[PDB]
Design a protein around this ligand. Structure first.
Ligand SMILES: [Zn+2]
Ligand SMILES: [Zn+2]
Length: 218
């Protein structure tokens, strides 16, 4: 009995989708992603944990007149890639970095159909930018910047209260990656983490501090 998928408007043209999964140690984990709307078309910023919630998400937008143009996954964990199988099965384009696809392949998981690399990649010119700050939460973690509304989807890289699951983390690299991210997006109005409430650019500094503290404790 999991909480239902939630879809809530965050700003003009930007929705937060929240899906839930039981993960041992944490209890039920809420996972936030975005849906970005440009001219009657929708881009998914992360997928829900499951095919079922991915279909629910897609259908909600389809029934409101939107065409699903693609999804992008911020890292390989299922909280961000759980819907790739379903989307690929509906011939909806999926994106992930080369690094993410390699970690999916290695895990016996279905890969995104489209991949990219480099420090930054424009999923949609002037509207949706993918940025790779370096390894942290995972080796492949990327963020998504919406320059018009100044909204940064930080995913699991933004960890302002504690770093969380270190199983796939690069504790030595995270402070350098977090300094770079803070430098890059200090102009953010909103910063959307995966598992906690939306905040402002202070989440970037708080994440850096947590990364430093975690390195110094290792
Ligand atoms: Zn993760
Ligand atoms: Zn997470």
């Amino acid at each position: 009995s999991l909480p239902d998928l939630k879809i809530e408007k965050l700003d003009e043209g930007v929705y937060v989708h929240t899906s839930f999964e039981e993960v041992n140690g944490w209890g039920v984990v809420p996972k936030h992603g975005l849906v970005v709307l440009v001219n009657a078309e929708a881009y998914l910023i992360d997928t829900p944990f499951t095919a079922k919630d991915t279909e629910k998400l897609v259908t909600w937008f389809v029934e409101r007149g939107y065409k699903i143009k693609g999804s992008i996954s911020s890292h390989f964990h299922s909280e961000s890639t759980g819907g790739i199988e379903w989307l690929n099965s509906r011939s909806i384009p999926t994106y992930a970095s080369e690094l993410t696809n390699e970690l999916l392949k290695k895990d016996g998981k279905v890969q995104a159909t489209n991949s990219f690399s480099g420090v930054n990649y424009w999923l949609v010119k002037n509207k949706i930018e993918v940025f790779y700050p370096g390894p942290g939460h995972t080796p492949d973690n990327v963020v998504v910047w919406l320059p018009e509304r100044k909204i940064l989807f930080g995913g699991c890289f933004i960890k302002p209260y504690g770093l969380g699951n270190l199983g796939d983390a690069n504790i030595e690299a995270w402070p350098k990656s977090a300094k770079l991210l803070k430098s890059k997006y200090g102009k953010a109005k909103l910063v959307v983490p995966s598992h906690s409430e939306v905040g402002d650019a202070s989440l970037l500094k708080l994440t850096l501090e947590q990364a430093v503290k975690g390195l110094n404790e290792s």
